[PDB]
Amino acid sequence: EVETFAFQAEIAQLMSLIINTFYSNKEIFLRELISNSSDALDKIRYESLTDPSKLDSGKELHINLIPSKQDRTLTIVDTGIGMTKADLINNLGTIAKSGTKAFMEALQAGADISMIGQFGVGFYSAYLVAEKVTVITKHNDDEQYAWESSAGGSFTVRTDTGEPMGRGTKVILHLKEDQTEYLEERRIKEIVKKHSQFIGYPITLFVEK
Ligand SMILES: CC(C)(C)C1=NO[C@@H](Cn2cnc3c(Cl)nc(N)nc32)C1
């Protein structure tokens, strides 16, 4: 079964702003997703210090960047703590409502879209470059889920039938047709070096076959 949900009005407004505002500096999406992965890796590492069994689903703590020219996707994979069903449907959106309102006000007060991560809603910068985002995620003691949205005010959640991940999150960016530069090894290297060079987990940039 696929369940369809309405975004909170403030998050739908944020997504429309990101999709519709003219802003050439689109590359900031990657730093935001890598930062989210780093935060999730921090969380499972910290929890493992008092409950080592939390790493039974995988001890490797890393970030993979995987381009696919054939699928026109850029995938950001981490082995962090992952998200529960309640995270996906309700609880992360509840936290994001406050940051969205703060971001939207700062925007009017002269802030830049690149400051989005300071408001805890950096994920939605993915819609600078993606027409659709699919998020596959697995938290210990919950099932593997697929979250998906092409914006337009709704998202879906379903139990994922694909390959099991163990633990963590995969953000699959279905790139807009004019945003395929973010499949180039060279371009991704440039962005990671510029924005993400001090992240405390190995970032592997996969090469296309
Ligand atoms: C609900 C949805 C749109 C999918 C997000 N809201 O929060 C986002 C940022 N975020 C929160 N928890 C995260 C974990 Cl555990 N990992 C990673 N990579 N990102 C995480 C994602």
From Swiss-Prot:
Task: Provide the binding site for ATP.
Answer: 36, 78, 97, 123
Q: Which residues carry this modification: N6-acetyllysine?
A: 43, 69
UniProt's post-translational modification comment states: ISGylated. S-nitrosylated; negatively regulates the ATPase activity and the activation of eNOS by HSP90AA1.
Where does it reside? Nucleus; Cytoplasm; Melanosome; Cell membrane
Residues in coiled coil: none
Q: Which domain of life is it from?
A: Eukaryota
- List the residue ranges of the region (Interaction with NR3C1): 1-209
Q: Which family does it belong to?
A: Belongs to the heat shock protein 90 family.
Function noted in UniProt? Molecular chaperone that promotes the maturation, structural maintenance and proper regulation of specific target proteins involved for instance in cell cycle control and signal transduction. Undergoes a functional cycle that is linked to its ATPase activity which is essential for its chaperone activity. This cycle probably induces conformational changes in the client proteins, thereby causing their activation. Interacts dynamically with various co-chaperones that modulate its substrate recognition, ATPase cycle and chaperone function.
- What quaternary structure, including any partners, is listed in this protein's UniProt entry? Homodimer. Identified in NR3C1/GCR steroid receptor-chaperone complexes formed at least by NR3C1, HSP90AA1 and a variety of proteins containing TPR repeats such as FKBP4, FKBP5, PPID, PPP5C or STIP1. Forms a complex containing HSP90AA1, TSC1 and TSC2; TSC1 is required to recruit TCS2 to the complex. The closed form interacts (via the middle domain and TPR repeat-binding motif) with co-chaperone TSC1 (via C-terminus). Interacts with TOM34. Interacts with TERT; the interaction, together with PTGES3, is required for correct assembly and stabilization of the TERT holoenzyme complex.
Q: What is written about domains in the entry's comments?
A: The TPR repeat-binding motif mediates interaction with TPR repeat-containing proteins like the co-chaperone STUB1.
| Name the UniProt record assigns to this protein | Heat shock protein HSP 90-alpha
Protein's gene? Hsp90aa1
The shown range, given as first to last of full length, is 16 to 224 of 733
